[PDB]
Design an enzyme around this catalytic site. Sequence first.
Site, PDB file in Angstrom:
ATOM      1  N   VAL A 283       0.942  -1.328  -0.039  1.00 45.34           N
ATOM      2  CA  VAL A 283      -0.094   0.007  -0.117  1.00 45.34           C
ATOM      3  C   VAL A 283       0.954   1.276   0.024  1.00 45.34           C
ATOM      4  CG1 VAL A 283      -2.081   0.962   0.944  1.00 45.34           C
ATOM      5  CG2 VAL A 283      -1.711  -1.156   1.073  1.00 45.34           C
ATOM      6  N   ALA A 284       1.859   1.297   0.679  1.00 44.70           N
ATOM      7  CA  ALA A 284       2.825   2.555   0.776  1.00 44.70           C
ATOM      8  C   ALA A 284       3.384   2.829  -0.417  1.00 44.70           C
ATOM      9  CB  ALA A 284       3.625   2.358   2.197  1.00 44.70           C
ATOM     10  N   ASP A 330      -2.815  23.438 -42.682  1.00 43.26           N
ATOM     11  CA  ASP A 330      -3.438  23.889 -44.067  1.00 43.26           C
ATOM     12  C   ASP A 330      -3.326  25.207 -43.962  1.00 43.26           C
ATOM     13  OD1 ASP A 330      -5.453  23.467 -46.149  1.00 43.26           O
ATOM     14  OD2 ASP A 330      -6.602  24.535 -44.667  1.00 43.26           O
ATOM     15  N   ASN A 712      -2.287   8.138   1.800  1.00 43.10           N
ATOM     16  CA  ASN A 712      -1.940   8.118   0.326  1.00 43.10           C
ATOM     17  C   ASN A 712      -3.178   8.761  -0.464  1.00 43.10           C
ATOM     18  OD1 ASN A 712       0.694   7.081   0.450  1.00 43.10           O
ATOM     19  ND2 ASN A 712      -0.059   4.904   0.014  1.00 43.10           N
ATOM     20  N   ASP A 716      -2.791  13.292   1.181  1.00 48.79           N
ATOM     21  CA  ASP A 716      -1.742  13.530  -0.080  1.00 48.79           C
ATOM     22  C   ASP A 716      -2.437  14.148  -1.342  1.00 48.79           C
ATOM     23  OD1 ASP A 716       0.170  13.293   1.845  1.00 48.79           O
ATOM     24  OD2 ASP A 716       1.381  11.942   0.516  1.00 48.79           O
TER      25      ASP A 716
END
Length: 883
Positions: A283-284, A330, A712, A716
């Site tokens: 997880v980290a 173009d 997380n 963050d």
Amino acid sequence: AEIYRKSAAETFTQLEATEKGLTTSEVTKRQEKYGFNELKDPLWKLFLETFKDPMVIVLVIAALVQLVLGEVVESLIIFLVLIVNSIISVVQTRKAESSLDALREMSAPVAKVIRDGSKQSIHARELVPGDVVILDAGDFVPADGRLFESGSLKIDEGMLTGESEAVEKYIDTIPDEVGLGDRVNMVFSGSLVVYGRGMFVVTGTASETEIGKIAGLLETAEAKQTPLQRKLESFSKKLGLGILALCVLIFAVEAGRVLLGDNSADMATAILNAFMFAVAVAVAAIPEALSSIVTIVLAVGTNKMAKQHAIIRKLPAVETLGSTSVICTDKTGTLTQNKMTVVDYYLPDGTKENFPESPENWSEGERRLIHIAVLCNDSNINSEGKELGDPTEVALIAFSNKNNQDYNEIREKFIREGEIPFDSDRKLMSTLHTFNENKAMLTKGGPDVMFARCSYVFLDGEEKPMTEEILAKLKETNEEFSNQALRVLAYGYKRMPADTTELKLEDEQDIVLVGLTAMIDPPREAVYASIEESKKAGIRTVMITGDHKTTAQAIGRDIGLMDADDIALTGQELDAMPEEELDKKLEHIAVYARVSPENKIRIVKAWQKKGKITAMTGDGVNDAPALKQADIGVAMGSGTDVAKDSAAMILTDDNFVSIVDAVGVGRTVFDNIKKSIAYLFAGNLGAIIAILFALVLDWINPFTALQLLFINLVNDSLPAIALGMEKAEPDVMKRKPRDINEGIFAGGTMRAVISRGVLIGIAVIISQYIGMQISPEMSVAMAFTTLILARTLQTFAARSNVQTAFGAGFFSNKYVIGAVLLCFVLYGITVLPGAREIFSIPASFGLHEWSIAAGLALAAVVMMEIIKVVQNKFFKDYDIPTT
Ligand SMILES: CCCCCCCC/C=C\CCCCCCCC(=O)OC[C@H](COP(=O)(O)OCC[N+](C)(C)C)OC(=O)CCCCCCC/C=C\CCCCCCCC
Ligand SMILES: CCCCCCCC/C=C\CCCCCCCC(=O)O[C@H](COC(=O)CCCCCCC/C=C/CCCCCCCC)COP(=O)(O)OCC[N+](C)(C)C
Ligand code: BEF
Ligand SMILES: [Mg+2]
């Protein structure tokens, strides 16, 4: 397709048809052979293909292990982020399917055919090769075919060449091979008849037509992978392998410790710790909120482009604009504005660099030239500003209005007393006017037919022209205008008997010549500066037009792509080159002229084959295949709906400088994404360092999976977004396009990540040790506090790799300030008496232990800024820090 080189009779015998039409039985028979005259990956189990991503595999395994361990809600949290980010990828693939539509509601709905000996109107979808179709003005060409009867027929083939001007058609056989726009004896489905009568035999229907070829080209255009997407794929593989190695090492350390150590611990306790440490590291290490944060940063980029009236359909497209290396454009409608405009003029009694802007500052030659240009035409501009009349004639009243002389005042002051209409076999136009009791005949037309009827010139008075230095100078300046691809008109007048009330055709001799004009389709004003701006950014600009070579070289010589006597490749010359020769000549062209819709998509594919991220800007149906094939397609807001549906960004205000601006915006988008990712992983790295240290020393796991998930995901997310809102760097747009194979941490970002991560880790290790002096539970509370607060405070250090927070402006980014304050509120929520046992914070955790942990986080962030300032003041060539 080689039919234009045959006669009408040969085409007729080829289609087994005559010019008196087809019968019903033959039409039914050919409908079984050819069909009717009409045109004609994605699947929602791809939610399963999202599970091939390594980060997904890692999180799925971590989730299942936690399920077995009893940590159910954190397993559910992981499944939520998995389901959500998977739909973030499905919304990026689903909308691209409605870009695969090929909506051709521009095909003709009616065909005026001869069948069974009778003229009748049918659904155009029922046409078949061999049918005889009649064309009149304002009709839409129902199918491709060879003309065999034409009465001054003029068609607008702007769908194939990009030029809205009507081309004259002729039934004559074309002896040589010419390009697609110059197929004078051929009519094409989708075009609009402008003037005249015609009659052609159908040679192509359904997808066997030039517009059908365009539809097939749109079909084959397949989407590319984004540069950011490639960088994230490669980095995700690296992260998965690393995590697998760390988990193998975790089990190895736990097994060796129970095998070659104290018998005190159980096999069960050691295996449970091995699993807990493996899941914790899993997880980290994964930044679970990354794709979500990246989407928000991309959205900020697309919104910043939207303020400039540039609407980007797909979010990742803005970042792709930043990696652009080639910009194919173009001409007509894109580089220019499809607006005939007077650009040069010649007066024999003194020509100035620019035409003056005060109507009272003009010379008699200048006022007579303007009066003849305004009074000798039938064009008008209303109060709303709508232009009505031939664009050549509207150019003249637009020229007068540009120079502060309202054309209406001249039309109102001098009224028309007689006219001679413009003749085809006599390209000339005259009007009768009374100028202060003197009747005059004003006359204008091309120099070739006008010089033959001029017997006087207007220098100081009315003076006869000598062949040397008057007629020779006039022809010298006319051919000089033709060398610069300028439409020239000669003007003049004739004093007339005061008793005349009408004009005769015999009265167009012995004219007094006044002056000349030169008009072209000029580039947009912002084009010159945008092309120079893109050159400073390492961007090659290529011009791909369906217009004539002379015009396409005159422009492009004017915007800074061609020097004098540089040649443009033509579609004729391009179709004869194989791909190997084109690969060796591709990097030395700058201008392709008179190209077919397949030529543009071929050039864009060739530039992509060189590995360059290419942008294509366009405004018409001939650009649509190249707009969809290009890495980033940009359509003009005033362009056709086909090109807009085929493009990824649309310039609503036709502001050409938006393209280069989008590149600049795109560049900062990626810079800020890099910042956010570097900010995210520096925190993950600190967390890993703290866990592994706790592993090799047999400490308690400093973190919980629930804590790591909360950091997380919740703590963050705002700081990463705030870093996404960082101002553009000074030297951006002085840089070259980034390499696609460049990693996501290239260029000092990897050094920054490791420096900040190691410092956060050392802070958590010391914090956990200090807490370990009281109890293992106190060590977890202090390790969690230092980790979350060092990650919160790191945002100041993560705002820039080369500049301290105090230096850039400690309040220069207000979103970072708000993010840090909000994260302080988050940390406070975790120590509230209800959520303490949720976040594994013991009841004895006080302001003293909090003071030590918070001080450790602050000290680590100050060390990050000290290390950065030493690195950029003393090692500023290749930034690398020491202390
Ligand atoms: C209004 C404008 C500002 C907006 C931004 C900030 C707003 C957020 C503020 C609060 C949100 C709600 C949180 C309030 C509740 C927590 C305060 C609290 O309930 O406190 C009491 C406890 C213990 O009290 P005690 O030890 O007396 O009893 C010890 C005796 N026994 C051991 C028996 C327990 O304390 C603890 O749990 C320690 C908890 C300390 C909470 C501090 C949170 C601040 C976050 C970051 C600060 C930045 C760090 C910078 C570096 C600092 C270097 C020093
Ligand atoms: C949140 C917790 C999650 C855990 C639960 C685990 C199970 C979840 C499984 C499925 C969720 C169903 C929701 C799907 C969203 C709608 C799809 C959609 O709308 O796409 C379809 C798109 O068609 C396609 O192009 C082809 C793809 C078809 C999608 C098929 C999805 C069917 C799902 C099957 C699940 C199988 C499990 C069966 C279990 C039975 C045991 C009792 C709808 O097309 P349409 O013809 O309806 O109309 C279309 C009208 N137009 C196009 C104008 C909008
Ligand atoms: F309209 Be583009 F110049 F073919
Ligand atoms: Mg065009």
